[PDB]
Design an enzyme around this catalytic site. Structure first.
Site, PDB file in Angstrom:
ATOM      1  N   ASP A 351       0.856  -1.175   0.000  1.00 28.23           N
ATOM      2  CA  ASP A 351       0.000   0.000   0.000  1.00 28.23           C
ATOM      3  C   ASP A 351       0.894   1.228   0.000  1.00 28.23           C
ATOM      4  O   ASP A 351       1.903   1.260   0.707  1.00 28.23           O
ATOM      5  CB  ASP A 351      -0.929  -0.001   1.220  1.00 28.23           C
ATOM      6  CG  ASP A 351      -1.760   1.256   1.328  1.00 28.23           C
ATOM      7  OD1 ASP A 351      -2.368   1.678   0.323  1.00 28.23           O
ATOM      8  OD2 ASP A 351      -1.808   1.828   2.434  1.00 28.23           O
ATOM      9  N   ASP A 699      -2.318  -0.181   5.866  1.00 34.60           N
ATOM     10  CA  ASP A 699      -2.592   0.483   7.136  1.00 34.60           C
ATOM     11  C   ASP A 699      -4.030   0.983   7.209  1.00 34.60           C
ATOM     12  O   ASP A 699      -4.615   1.043   8.294  1.00 34.60           O
ATOM     13  CB  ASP A 699      -1.632   1.655   7.353  1.00 34.60           C
ATOM     14  CG  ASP A 699      -1.902   2.818   6.415  1.00 34.60           C
ATOM     15  OD1 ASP A 699      -2.235   2.581   5.234  1.00 34.60           O
ATOM     16  OD2 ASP A 699      -1.789   3.978   6.862  1.00 34.60           O
ATOM     17  N   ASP A 703      -7.501  -1.318   2.878  1.00 34.84           N
ATOM     18  CA  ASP A 703      -6.695  -2.524   2.779  1.00 34.84           C
ATOM     19  C   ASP A 703      -7.267  -3.698   3.559  1.00 34.84           C
ATOM     20  O   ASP A 703      -6.761  -4.816   3.415  1.00 34.84           O
ATOM     21  CB  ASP A 703      -5.271  -2.245   3.266  1.00 34.84           C
ATOM     22  CG  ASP A 703      -4.680  -0.998   2.649  1.00 34.84           C
ATOM     23  OD1 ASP A 703      -4.860  -0.794   1.433  1.00 34.84           O
ATOM     24  OD2 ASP A 703      -4.042  -0.217   3.383  1.00 34.84           O
TER      25      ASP A 703
HETATM   26  F1  BEF Z   1      -2.569   4.056  -0.894  1.00 28.08           F
HETATM   27 BE1  BEF Z   1      -3.290   3.144   0.103  1.00 28.08          BE
HETATM   28  F2  BEF Z   1      -4.729   2.786  -0.382  1.00 28.08           F
HETATM   29  F3  BEF Z   1      -3.438   3.870   1.462  1.00 28.08           F
HETATM   30 MG   LIG Z   2      -2.841   3.231   3.347  1.00 23.38          MG
END
Ligand code: BEF
Ligand SMILES: [Mg+2]
Length: 1015
Positions: A351, A699, A703
């Site tokens: 992420d 986080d 996700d």
């Molecule tokens: F870029 Be991730 F969805 F926080």
């Molecule tokens: Mg994130």
């Protein structure tokens, strides 16, 4: 209330029957509470101790041990004997091993839940609403708000529910939605309806989503969704709906258990079949049923003895030790089998916002001018090393430390930064980390000002709470801020009017997008000189600004200028935007800064180590494609000049891709941007469809479904609670290198697990072959179940735990992850542990028989008499009286036990490496193995040399020559395992110089075996 964003304020207000200025009456409040419930995300805790135990007993190995224990118990219940004191010890102890194990695992669960809950944000979740009881603002609990409430939001507040905007009172509304949408930068909100009913949350500019803070401004909205009907509630429901599958380690263990059960059944059937003709023997009673069930009982008793009692216990011990090692480096692992999952992981989905980046925007580059000659200029460029909000970085020019007093333009730039913002930086005593107050970019400017001590104020004795605002406080004490010119959409700049506090002026400080400031400035601040603008210098500034905001180091550029002689306050009227246009004229360019959401400093090394170890990292994010690709290039997922026309995709691009094209993208693409949580889960599922172990890291709330769908989900310690509840492991210290550390730990754990599993299986099959050989020939029994229990739990238990500490392979991190389809124990291993097992059985039987035939001082009984153990009568023996009293002597049993123990220790010393010889890898490195061997020898000698135990176990002290014979029998297991290992491999000196005297010492003499007959 569906698709509220598509409806105007009048429509939603009429639907809820609530007035904009008054609010909800107390009657409507309870009427909406009874219908819509209350504003809480459900927190379910059904993992009771009973549930934990029953789900931990799901393991097939534990089920096989339970079946063996119950069959042994029912066998011992129908033994028609008076030895029930010991006959029931064998099953009962197994139950203890089966139950104690459970607590250990359960303990780990609770321990994880005790640690993960510790690193949770705790605050009173409040909400400012308007209700008809009183006209003023009412600060109530967020759980006591209902769909229809009129909520007022201000800077530095967390919105409590899904809210449709009604009116914006600050002429702007900036909302940080990195928690939900994954956007790194705050989004501008408006009141106009969004015509698209299938619109995603990123372009719902009239909507407010619960759990997202307000970056700047004030606004007024109406609640439209609450509780589980919010976006985070829908994501949590989707997370719950996603099924969870067993870890790959558990699957391998279950496959090994199936193979072990098949082997057990085959052994039982074979033993039953070999004695078909003995069913009608008159000894049973001359019936086809009693003899059959008697031999079935014998075969099942033999089969039960081939299941290692302590195998799950040592597996759990190894898993718990690995989990403790991970916890020592700030990594909380929930389930014990999950500690191995990262070892076999082939793809790491990650992420961007908050996981691969600090989510704390910081200034990383800046420049001013140094000298002007003509149609060009010399540019002083500085780089700042800070990445988080902590003001501890340093300013570097040409990769060397530099001071700020020498550069007058730099102190002017710092003054403009600190005085042309209204946010702040503050330190939490409880949390222990600095954080922003308002906008992230303005906090980045504040932290930049703190980093470069332009006035060289003393900061050594300053406390951390007052470290946050020291230089900013000083240079705002120098200059009094009269009033602020608000930022505008039609003019990407914002200005501040400041006056020098000291008497004997009134400068203006302007910041904003570079293009507007440059076109509106007619002068240049070079050091302390106001030089007229030239086209060449402007082009040179544009060149650097574009190449700052267009390359792999994509940055958000802010141009900082000053107005030396502005119109005094009477002339200017703070009412209209065009007035703000015309007030910013004849500005003097001072400098420029460039900031971004910087990746964590342990990310590039971690991804290159992962690529070295055969793991590919794919970035999945909800942010725009440009920022995602820039971060991929910066951290090393992509090259600086690599073409990404087929390796970077958006959710919309992926939506209408061909199935073959989708497969090729999942195989090749390394960046996914603008994807919903459902799209993230779909990507994870597509990757898993190719038989790939996927590890998801995130986080935010977006996700959580992807963290749940992956075999192992890793959540950051600073992430949301819903993300942590969906993850099997949590990084408390937010260290990304813990991922590769866990990969190494898992691979080492898997190797050690294979080693000691092979060791235990070989030991148990050896004991079983010994029993079968004793039964077939007719020799007196050389081993007893209680002795086997001791040598399986202690004599085998300690070496297995020590083997759990085997040194890691040198080339462990330079190999691809293991193929998931391969079995835990292969066919070659299946052949090999049978060889050691068969040798153990034959050697133990021969050691028992040697004392009865060729041993000096013992009876020189022939094979015929020894084979006919039960025929001790007047059947023409030599010492008929002596033989009957010597066939039950404890000396052959002691020989068998000592040989079995010594061969097991030799096999344990042969279990340092799966295929690497003992000569090249001595036992020295695994000092735990040597200590365990010495301890087991010490306790074995203690058993042999105390008062009660030689009675409990029918054993007696041996002689020096008898120990020499035991060593003679035991040692060739080293040679046979070495030759098998060499065969497998093909297709130091101090160790040798100590082992040679031992070998030459024990083979001085030999004894011939006078036996040339077989049954
Ligand atoms: F870029 Be991730 F969805 F926080
Ligand atoms: Mg994130």
């Amino acid at each position: 209330m569906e698709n509220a964003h598509t409806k105007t304020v009048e429509e939603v207000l009429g639907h809820f029957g609530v007035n904009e200025s008054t609010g909800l009456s107390l009657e409507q409040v309870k009427k909406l509470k009874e219908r819509w419930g209350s504003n809480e995300l459900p927190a379910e805790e059904g993992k009771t101790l009973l549930e934990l135990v029953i789900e931990q007993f799901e393991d097939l190995l534990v089920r096989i041990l339970l079946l063996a224990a119950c069959i042994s118990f029912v066998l011992a219940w129908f033994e028609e004997g008076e030895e029930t004191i010991t006959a029931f010890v064998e099953p009962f102890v197994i139950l203890l091993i089966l139950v104690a194990n459970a607590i250990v695992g359960v303990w780990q669960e609770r321990n994880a839940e005790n640690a993960i809950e510790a690193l949770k944000e705790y605050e009173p979740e409040m909400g400012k609403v308007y209700r008809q009881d009183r006209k003023s603002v009412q600060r109530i609990k967020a759980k006591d708000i209902v769909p229809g409430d009129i909520v007022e939001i201000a800077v530095g507040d967390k919105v409590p529910a899904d809210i449709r905007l009604t009116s914006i009172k600050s002429t702007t509304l900036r909302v940080d939605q990195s928690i939900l949408t994954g956007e790194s930068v705050s989004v501008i909100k408006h009141t106009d309806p969004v015509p698209d009913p299938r619109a995603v949350n990123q372009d719902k500019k009239n909507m407010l989503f619960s759990g997202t803070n307000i970056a700047a401004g004030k606004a007024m909205g109406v609640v439209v969704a609450t509780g589980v009907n919010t976006e985070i509630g829908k994501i949590r429901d989707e997370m719950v709906a996603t099924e969870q599958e067993r870890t790959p380690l558990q699957q391998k263990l279950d496959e090994f258990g199936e193979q072990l059960s098949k082997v057990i059944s085959l052994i039982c059937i074979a033993v039953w079949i070999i004695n078909i003709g003995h069913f009608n023997d008159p000894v049973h009673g001359g019936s086809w049923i009693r003899g059959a069930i008697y031999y079935f009982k014998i075969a099942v008793a033999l089969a039960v003895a081939a299941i290692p009692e302590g195998l799950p216990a040592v597996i759990t011990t190894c898993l718990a030790l690995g989990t403790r090692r991970m916890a020592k480096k700030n990594a909380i692992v929930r389930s014990l089998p999950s500690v191995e999952t990262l070892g076999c992981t082939s793809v790491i989905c990650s992420d961007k916002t908050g996981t691969l980046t600090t989510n704390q925007m910081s200034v990383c580059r800046m420049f001013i001018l140094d000298r002007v000659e003509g149609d060009t200029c010399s540019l002083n460029e500085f780089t700042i090393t800070g990445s988080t909000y902590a003001p501890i970085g340093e300013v570097h020019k040409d990769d060397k430390p530099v001071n700020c007093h020498q550069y007058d333009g730099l102190v002017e730039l710092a003054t403009i930064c600190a005085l042309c913002n209204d946010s702040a930086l503050d330190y939490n005593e409880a949390k222990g980390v600095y954080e922003k107050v308002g906008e992230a970019t303005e906090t980045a400017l504040t932290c930049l000002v703190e980093k470069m001590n332009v006035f060289d104020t003393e900061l050594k004795g300053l406390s951390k709470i007052e470290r946050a605002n020291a230089c900013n406080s000083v240079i705002k004490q120098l200059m009094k801020k009269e009033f602020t010119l608000e930022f505008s959409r039609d003019r990407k700049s914002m200005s501040v009017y400041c006056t020098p506090n000291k008497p004997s002026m009134s400068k203006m400080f302007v910041k904003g997008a570079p293009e507007g400031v440059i076109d509106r400035c007619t002068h240049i601040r070079v050091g302390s000189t106001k030089v007229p603008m030239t086209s060449g210098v402007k082009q040179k500034i544009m060149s650097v600004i574009r190449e700052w905001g267009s390359g792999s180091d994509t940055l958000r550029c802010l141009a900082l200028a000053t107005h030396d002689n502005p119109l005094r306050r009477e002339e200017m009227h703070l009412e209209d935007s065009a007035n703000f246009i015309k007030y910013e004229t004849n500005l003097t360019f001072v400098g420029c800064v460039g900031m971004l959401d910087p990746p964590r400093i342990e990310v590039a090394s971690s991804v290159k180590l992962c690529r070295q170890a055969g793991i590919r990292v794919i970035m999945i994010t909800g942010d725009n494609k440009g920022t995602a690709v820039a971060i991929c290039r910066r951290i090393g997922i992509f090259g600086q000049d690599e073409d990404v026309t087929s390796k970077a995709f958006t959710g919309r691009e992926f939506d209408e891709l061909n199935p073959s094209a989708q497969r090729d993208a999942c195989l090749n693409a390394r960046c996914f941007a603008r994807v919903e949580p459902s799209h993230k889960s779909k990507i994870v599922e597509f990757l898993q469809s190719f038989d790939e172990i996927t590890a998801m890291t995130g986080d935010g709330v977006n996700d959580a479904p992807a963290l749940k769908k992956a075999e192992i989900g890793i959540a950051m310690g600073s992430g949301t609670a819903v993300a942590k509840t969906a993850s099997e492991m949590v990084l408390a210290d937010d260290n990304f290198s813990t991922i590769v550390a866990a990969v190494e730990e898992g691979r080492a754990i898997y190797n050690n697990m294979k080693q000691f599993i092979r060791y235990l299986i070989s030991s148990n099959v050896g004991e079983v072959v010994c029993i079968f050989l004793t039964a077939a020939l007719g020799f007196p029994e050389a081993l007893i179940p209680v002795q086997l229990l001791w040598v399986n739990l202690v004599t085998d238990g300690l070496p297995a735990t020590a083997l759990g500490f085997n040194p890691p392979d040198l080339d462990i991190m330079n190999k691809p992850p293991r193929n998931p389809k391969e079995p835990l124990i292969s066919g070659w291993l299946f052949f090999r542990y049978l060889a050691i097992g068969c040798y153990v059985g034959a050697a133990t039987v021969g050691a028992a028989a040697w004392w009865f035939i060729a041993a000096d001082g013992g009876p020189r009984v022939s094979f015929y008499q020894l084979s006919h153990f039960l025929q001790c009568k007047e059947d023409n023996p030599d010492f008929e009286g002596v033989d009957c009293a010597i066939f039950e002597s404890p000396y052959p049993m002691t020989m068998a036990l000592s040989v079995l123990v010594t061969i097991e220790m030799c096999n344990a010393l042969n279990s340092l490496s799966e295929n690497q010889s003992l000569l090249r890898m001595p036992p020295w490195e695994n000092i735990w193995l040597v200590g365990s061997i010495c301890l087991s020898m010490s306790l074995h000698f203690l058993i042999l040399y105390v008062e009660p135990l030689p009675l409990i176990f029918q054993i007696t002290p041996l002689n020096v020559t008898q120990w020499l014979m035991v060593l003679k029998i035991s040692l060739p297991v080293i040679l046979m395992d070495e030759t098998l290992k060499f065969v497998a491999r093909n297709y130091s000196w101090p160790f040798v110089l100590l082992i040679m005297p031992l070998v030459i010492w024990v083979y001085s003499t030999d004894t011939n075996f006078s036996d040339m007959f077989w049954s």
